[PDB]
Structure formats: structure tokens, C-alpha cells
Amino acid sequence: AARPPEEVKAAFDDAIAARENEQQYIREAEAYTNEVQPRANGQAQRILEEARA
Amino acid sequence: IPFIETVKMLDARIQTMDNQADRFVTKEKKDLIVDSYIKWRISDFSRYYLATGGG
């Protein structure tokens, strides 16, 4: 075995967790987009109906 | 022959040796914890008895 010391092992684990968090941020951004767009569509329909009225 | 010949018994049945949790390093420095087991048999009983002190 050629493991690095424990102190830097913590940093190695942090780097792997950083990769996972990097993926998670993009996932949340796509979530925000998919959430926000339908609300815009609904507001557009609402203002169109208000104009008709 | 009494008092001159002793007998040592070696089991020819397959023995199973399991390894506890241990950490391995992949190519991208991703630490893994691996549990594995091995199954082994004795091929040459005399050679095995000699190699390992007392069998």
C-alpha cells in the first residue's frame, strides 16, 4: 500500500465530493429552468385572456 | 510404527479465506472499499507442509 497521509486524504475525499457537487449544481440549474418556464407560459396565457376580456 | 512415526493431517477440502474491508486507489485517485474472498486447495501436501512451518 502507498496511501498518502490522512491529512491529505481528507483533501482527496473533498476533491471527489467537489466533482459530485459540480454535477449537482448543473442539475439544480436545469431544475430551475424547467420550473420557471411553465410559469412564464401560464402568465402569458393569463395576460392574453385579460386582453380578450 | 509406534513412538517413531507421527502423522500430520491436511484437509484437502477447499478452504475459503475472506478479506476485511480495505481501501484501493483507482486510476483517478478515487478511493474504493473492497470486500473479496478467495478459495484455495492444497496441491502438493508435502510441499505445502514444508513451505508453511508445521502445515
Task: Please describe the structure with a list of short key phrases separated by commas or semicolons.
part of a larger assembly; 2 chains; A: 53 residues; mainly alpha; 89% helix; B: 55 residues; mainly beta; 1 helix; 2 strands; 38% strand; rod-shaped; Modulator of FtsH protease HflC (chain B)
Report how far apart the termini of chain A are.
77 Å
Write down the Rg of chain A.
23 Å
Number of helices of chain A: 1
Distance between the termini of chain B: 22 Å
**What is the structural class of chain B?**
mainly beta
Organism (chain B): Escherichia coli
Subcellular location (chain B): Membrane
Family (chain B): Belongs to the band 7/mec-2 family. HflC subfamily.
Protein name (chain B): Modulator of FtsH protease HflC
Report what the structure shows.
The structure is cut from a larger assembly and holds chains A (53 residues) and B (55 residues). Chain A is mainly α. Helix content of chain A is 89%, strand content 0%. Chain A has 1 helix and no strands. The longest helix of chain A is centred in the middle third of the chain and has 47 residues, at 6-52. Chain B has a two-stranded antiparallel ribbon. The two termini of chain B are 22 Å apart. At the A-B interface, helix 1 of A face loops of B. Chain B: HflC and HflK help govern the stability of phage lambda cII protein, and thereby control the lysogenization frequency of phage lambda. HflKC inhibits the SecY-degrading activity of FtsH, possibly helping quality control of integral membrane proteins. Chain B: Belongs to the band 7/mec-2 family. HflC subfamily. Chain B: It comes from Escherichia coli.
